[PDB]
Amino acid sequence: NNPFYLRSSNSFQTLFENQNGRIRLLQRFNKRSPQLENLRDYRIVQFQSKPNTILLPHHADADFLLFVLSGRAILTLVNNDDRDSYNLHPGDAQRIPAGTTYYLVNPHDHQNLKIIKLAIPVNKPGRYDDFFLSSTQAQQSYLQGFSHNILETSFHSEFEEINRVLLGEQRQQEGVIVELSKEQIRQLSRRAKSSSRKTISSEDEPFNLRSRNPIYSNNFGKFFEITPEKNPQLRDLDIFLSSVDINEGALLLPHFNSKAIVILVINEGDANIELVGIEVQRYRAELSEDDVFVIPAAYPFVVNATSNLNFLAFGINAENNQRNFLAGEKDNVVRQIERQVQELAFPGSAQDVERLLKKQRESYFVDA
Amino acid sequence: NNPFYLRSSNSFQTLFENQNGRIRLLQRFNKRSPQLENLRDYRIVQFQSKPNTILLPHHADADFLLFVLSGRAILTLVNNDDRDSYNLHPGDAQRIPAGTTYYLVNPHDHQNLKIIKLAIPVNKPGRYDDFFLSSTQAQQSYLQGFSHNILETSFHSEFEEINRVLLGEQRQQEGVIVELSKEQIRQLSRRAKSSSRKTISSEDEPFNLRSRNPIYSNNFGKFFEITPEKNPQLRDLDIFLSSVDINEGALLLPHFNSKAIVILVINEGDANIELVGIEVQRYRAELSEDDVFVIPAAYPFVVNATSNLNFLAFGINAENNQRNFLAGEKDNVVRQIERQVQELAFPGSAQDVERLLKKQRESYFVDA
Amino acid sequence: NNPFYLRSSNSFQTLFENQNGRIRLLQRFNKRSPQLENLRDYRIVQFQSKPNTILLPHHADADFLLFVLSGRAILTLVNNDDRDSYNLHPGDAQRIPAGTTYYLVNPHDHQNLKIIKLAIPVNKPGRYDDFFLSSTQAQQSYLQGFSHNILETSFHSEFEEINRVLLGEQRQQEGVIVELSKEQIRQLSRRAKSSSRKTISSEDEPFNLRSRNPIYSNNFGKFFEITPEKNPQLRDLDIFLSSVDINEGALLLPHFNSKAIVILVINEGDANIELVGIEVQRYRAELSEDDVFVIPAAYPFVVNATSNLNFLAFGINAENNQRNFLAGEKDNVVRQIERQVQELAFPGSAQDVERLLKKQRESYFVDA
Known part of the structure; x- marks a missing residue:
């Protein structure tokens, strides 16, 4: 029994999982052994996705340091007035500052995509949450956490028009990782700044470890x-x-x-x-x-x-x-x-x- | 039962209160629900006073960021060689570093003074104590912690003399919020550096949100x-x-x-x-x-x-x-x-x- | 019973002791009273050794700020590619960054060496181990914790050889503080760069308080x-x-x-x-x-x-x-x-x- 060793077969926990990918979340370094108390603000997350797939838009209450092990990825952070896409090649690392809206695209035709990211939570030391804008058969949208009235007033629209279009209460996908069309991935993939030698020292763009x-x-x-x-x-x-x-x-x-x-x-x-x-x-x-x-x-x-x-x-x-x-x-x-x-x-x-x-x-x- | 909701009727605890005003101290954010474990180092204090009042000289073991909601205050931080007076208007924020002796005057004649400060305790996370220099019917002067023997030496005087002038073991005030004379408000007001528009980015003087x-x-x-x-x-x-x-x-x-x-x-x-x-x-x-x-x-x-x-x-x-x-x-x-x-x-x-x-x-x- | 008073005759704990000096550790500040919870990260160590002794090489999972009470001393910090020796006089003080191997010699011929040091653990809040490189009757070198196979491979040698020289499974010394030959303390004394007037704002060199x-x-x-x-x-x-x-x-x-x-x-x-x-x-x-x-x-x-x-x-x-x-x-x-x-x-x-x-x-x- 090695308190510093975590067997992937019994120390991860799957948050969501379907035929297009699974996301897994390591357990808490100090619930294993209190000897690890100074890691209590950290969590390890493993993401894998089949080719031609998208992780629907979302945000979380945690800083993300993501590193691409193998595959190719399109990382798109959305802001309130701006947007930023990035083409990640293996070795590339990028920080997703807490509560950014972002989606991940796997444009490859035959390769998977495996990302490990380091997660630092903001609200509860060690524990965090995933907020998904998207309305899936798996997850409700957090838009649904509001009331009819507050939704009606805020969108300036009656509730059926905002239900037939946003929430959908058969019309909605199966998971938070779904397939894409090539015409989509073709249009998506053209505006994504990628990693370079001159990025080893940039505060925005992804840097590559091995470069x-x-x-x-x-x-x-x-x-x-x-x-x-x-x-x-x-x-x-x-x-x-x-x-x-x-x-x-x-x-x-x-x-x-x-x-x-x-x-x-x-x-x-x-x-x-x-x-x-x-x-x-x-x-x-x-x-x-x-x-x-x-x-x-x-x-x-x-x-x-x-x-x-x-x-x-x-x-x-x-x-x-x-x-x-x-x-x-x-x-x-x-x-x-x-x-x-x-x-x-x-x-x-x-x-x-x-x-x-x-x-x-x-x-x-x-x-x- | 909203863990994130704190109701004034039952979430506050009165530290001091007489006719002239009252200091209320909100319950610890983390005692309510472990969900808020990150705010454990933060406390909300409400201060309210009646017109022509002064809060006698004290210091806390706690950094303060105080926001005058309504009224007008004359905040005097004293130092070991200097004295600083600040005329605060509604909307003014300032910062009282911890262990800074200070007082607070309500100069107005008909209006109340309604201040709220965010408090950051130094010694014990989420818990501080107020230390009043003054010796009042409601609280001893912390110079009384010391022995008579030490007091005589430090001030170079017999104890009867220092106990008649500083402590008074009926010649003393009722509380730590005392009433004022107009002539004294006349005197204490005239040196107060007032928040400005050049102050929005200054390290000492206050700064007005609404400005x-x-x-x-x-x-x-x-x-x-x-x-x-x-x-x-x-x-x-x-x-x-x-x-x-x-x-x-x-x-x-x-x-x-x-x-x-x-x-x-x-x-x-x-x-x-x-x-x-x-x-x-x-x-x-x-x-x-x-x-x-x-x-x-x-x-x-x-x-x-x-x-x-x-x-x-x-x-x-x-x-x-x-x-x-x-x-x-x-x-x-x-x-x-x-x-x-x-x-x-x-x-x-x-x-x-x-x-x-x-x-x-x-x-x-x-x-x- | 004053929670802010740590009597020397029952708040200390010997880590090691012999004829040549000893090393106590002051109990945990917070264990005593939860009032001292903001000192949870700090520990005090006391070091006293005899004249012409040495403290065999070692490191700790702790930063160190060590102060020289009395005696003179040679402090040697060894890096992966460098070595640095400092001559410490009474009132000198130096930081030993975490996990920096070091040994400490008392070159004086009659004077003791009293040193006290404030410790900041890096792994367990307020708790750190010593890792002794040496092999001694009192301690195992942290090279014994590797298998024979792994030890043999790494050094390029039979185990019967790395045991005869490094470990010794009689030939080994008795404690972590040993006495010294005067020619030996001679040769250790002649590269030590001493504290100066030039060193009160030096990031590397010790500084004299009373300077x-x-x-x-x-x-x-x-x-x-x-x-x-x-x-x-x-x-x-x-x-x-x-x-x-x-x-x-x-x-x-x-x-x-x-x-x-x-x-x-x-x-x-x-x-x-x-x-x-x-x-x-x-x-x-x-x-x-x-x-x-x-x-x-x-x-x-x-x-x-x-x-x-x-x-x-x-x-x-x-x-x-x-x-x-x-x-x-x-x-x-x-x-x-x-x-x-x-x-x-x-x-x-x-x-x-x-x-x-x-x-x-x-x-x-x-x-x-």
Whole structure:
């Protein structure tokens, strides 16, 4: 029983689901273990949709940091006087500020669309709600939460004309994810500003994580990372975003983040993971696809890919965070201590500890 | 039983009250219902005084944002080396940082003073204490907490002498709201820096909501707003203030705030409010003077004025908030959704939906 | 039973102890009383070590602000690619960012090293672990929490080798504080960059409190203070620091902090304290060496030095705090009230109250 490990088979909850897609909502990081109390303002959401589909317009009382894992998406935020569409390619991340009206389009003809978004609620710490303008057989419109009179007066129309057209009390769709026509998706898809190299530092438009050189790259893995220091949208939430690939056989060298609580959601592959906290204590767990693991601050952990692996991470409390590795060449903390202290720290000689710490010639990603 | 509705008749608790006025303190937002757990650090205080009165020198462990609803006050914040007097007119807001000693004078001869302040306690979340320098039949001077021994040394005098002059253990006032002499009102008034139009963006002196033009305004209402973008003192608290007037029979069209939790205080008039949440849920309540009603972020709501109405709204989590109306013409977000999305959203055409939304030729406030 | 008084003989808890020093942790501020709930995030640690000792390398899931009470010291912070050593003298203070590995050496040949540090946990509010890199009879290195397989792969080595050198499953030391060879403390002493006059506004380097002129100084007491305004480290924490010596028989005139919660620890000598909260509630207390007294924000309090006293204060939420005195000539709020409001606020004339306030002709510290 690993309180920091959430098995996707019994730790998500499906909000809506039909033949065109499903939306799933992770449970609450502190109802799992109160050790996770400082994540109580966060939730993980997973969205998947078949090709040629639309998530009907809606808003929620929560900041959204959405990241596109695979597929292509049209993200359209509607304002009161304005509108903004965006063409999302894999790797792209975008913030939906709380209570924006927005719909998602999957224009691809044969590929799905998988989005994980980080959700920070406004009203209730950890708990949020989805407001759907649309009138579906699944959900009532929140327009229906008003009275006949208040609707009549507000639309300057009698109630049948506003019922035959807005609410529909057989005429209305089956779900909050429905199919589209190609003539629609053709018309929709032409005005959507897409991600670029010059967006790595924009307060509006979506940025791509991988579009820059990783920070860690070798023949066994690559470590893409954007931090609050480079991107204003992330400075506002104080979160780093990282996508790292781990080739099968290889592993990520045991390390700890200095001050950041990391939320990693496995995207592809399998992996084992070892975490140490306090007399020491090992937190191992066997992660497959769509699972989630969370690493407390300054908690050293190893990620061991037992198949071809890519995960996404969320770094909570990400300002000025430092990754300290414990083995390998570059960015070792144990190889920076004064020699006479290394003598004193472990039962060994300065030369004898200097022997063991220099052996491993490679840094970050080694082979197993 | 509306969790978001707080009724004056049974939601307030009187901190002090005599013939000359009374300070009432609204119940904690979170004690009412855990739904409001985010406002736990906020309290609403009502202050009311009779003419030619003064509230004796005190300080709280609590930041104040005080809004003079009716009357005219002469607010004097004292510091350890300075003294500041501010002539406040109805509509004036100012901010009393916490631990600032101050007093409050009603100089008028026939009118009452009706102030409401939003309070942000420092020490214990949602709970502060008032600390009166003065020694009155209703409360000791907090200099009495100390021992006689310490008092003699600190002031360099025998205790009989300091107890005759500061504490008075019949020569003392009845309460903390005392009556005034005209000659003294004559003296205390003449130095008061008055709120201006150059002050709308000043870090000290107060600032008048109504001074600039309304954000919205037709023949059925006026919406006055002021935001952290325009005002330093408000950007600090990250709050917007708004005062809005609805004519008898008119209503504020259905709309929602994006991320701002709005504490509205009904100041004059009578309304019916309708809040919607989630399957939808109507939260209707019928409101009268001094009533309080909290609208969570991203919750749609309509204000129906059943008699000429004016309320005050505190906006919590204000920075970059957006008001999205569901009906009318200007700032309707239903009317910004792409046409092909209106086909698929509501049960009916996009010429049928384009027909309905165009009916109401007005915006913001309309007539019932 | 005063909820703001943490007696040293039953409010502390030893983390580790041996012949070479010990490390206690002050109990949770809120556990004691729910009144101290806004201190839920802060902890106090006490560090005392013998001459020519070391604290083996380690880190914590906590920010640290460590203050040097007495002794000299070498503090070494090791990064993934850098190492930095600081020479700490009495009255020096440094921030150790969360999860920064570090060790601490006492280079002096007879003097102890008393250090005290305020801690801000990053994972559990008010709760953090130490992670010791070293292998010792008292603790396991947090490398033991990885499997053999994983350990072997990472280092590139048989387990029989990484155990013989790093872990040791007799050859290992007894505690986390060990004694040192004089040539060893010699070699650790010669790169340490020391605190200066150049370092009171340096984001990296330690700063001396007593390095600048006190804010208050007279033949009975000195008052040193560094504020968020003048230091970059105390501004990201939003905290002030103060050392204040009070000669025996003197005292620190009644006063209160406008918005700072103050944690004070007594460094030497004895004081009586009186604190007033609210009808007025005195909270009196006879403090000795090592006790902690908390003053919530805006509560007036006095410190009464029964023996050549000096103490340390951590100011929580210090940005723009004002100190406000009630006796003595300078910084006297009670002297800044208008005359005619002095008439109304106490039983006594303006001539009468003016007379009694002018009597004490000194400021800040006076002879009792």
